[PDB]
Amino acid sequence: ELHLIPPLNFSMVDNGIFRSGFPDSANFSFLQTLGLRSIIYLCPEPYPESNLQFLKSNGIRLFQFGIEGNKEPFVNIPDHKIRMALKVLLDEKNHPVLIHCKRGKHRTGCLVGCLRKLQKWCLTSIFDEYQRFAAAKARVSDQRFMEIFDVSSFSHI
Numbered sequence: 001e002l003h004l005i006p007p008l009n010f011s012m013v014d015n016g017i018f019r020s021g022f023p024d025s026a027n028f029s030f031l032q033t034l035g036l037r038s039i040i041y042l043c044p045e046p047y048p049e050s051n052l053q054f055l056k057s058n059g060i061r062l063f064q065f066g067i068e069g070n071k072e073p074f075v076n077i078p079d080h081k082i083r084m085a086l087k088v089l090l091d092e093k094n095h096p097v098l099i100h101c102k103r104g105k106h107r108t109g110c111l112v113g114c115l116r117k118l119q120k121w122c123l124t125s126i127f128d129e130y131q132r133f134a135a136a137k138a139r140v141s142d143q144r145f146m147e148i149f150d151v152s153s154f155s156h157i
Contacts, residue, residue, distance in 0.1 A: 005026045007024075009133055013099070013112055014115075016095030016096045018098040018099065019100070021102055021104035023098075025050050031054070032058060036097065037061060037097065038097040039063065040065070040097055040098070043066060044067070045066075065085045072140070075139055077110050083154075106137070106139060109142055113145075113146040113149075114151075130142060
């Protein structure tokens with residue numbers, strides 16, 4: 001009866017935009033209900049065969065911008081990779097789009113926080129949303145990345 005299983009830390013960010021951790025086959029019938037056009041994938045690892053077959057069967061485009069895992073206090077969020085992902089995210093032709101890496105907290109959290117900065121949200125509101133997903137794994141380096149992210153080159157879009 002209660003048969004749909006959203007992926008780990010699943011949320012709707014905006015019209016046509018979702019965030020989560022890594023979907024597995026248990027999550028595919030739920031993802032099918034969203035009519036996705038795109039996945040923005042932020043892990044460096046190759047997409048598993050299971051997931052590739054799901055994308056092929058559903059006509060979903062895979063955009064990969066691989067960000068290596070880092071531990072505090074040595075967090076290094078690659079600005080270029082976040083900005084390449086943001087360029088894809090802001091094109092409505094890619095929507096509906098699911099953003100994911102592993103847990104839906106860090107790489108995912110940074111990309112969504114930078115979108116919120118472009119949407120003119122105050123930093124405390126951006127940080128509150130970031131912290132809601134990251135919970136006990138909230139990182140000051142992820143919020144610092146958002147604090148200094150220069151929105152100049154995206155301001156026109």
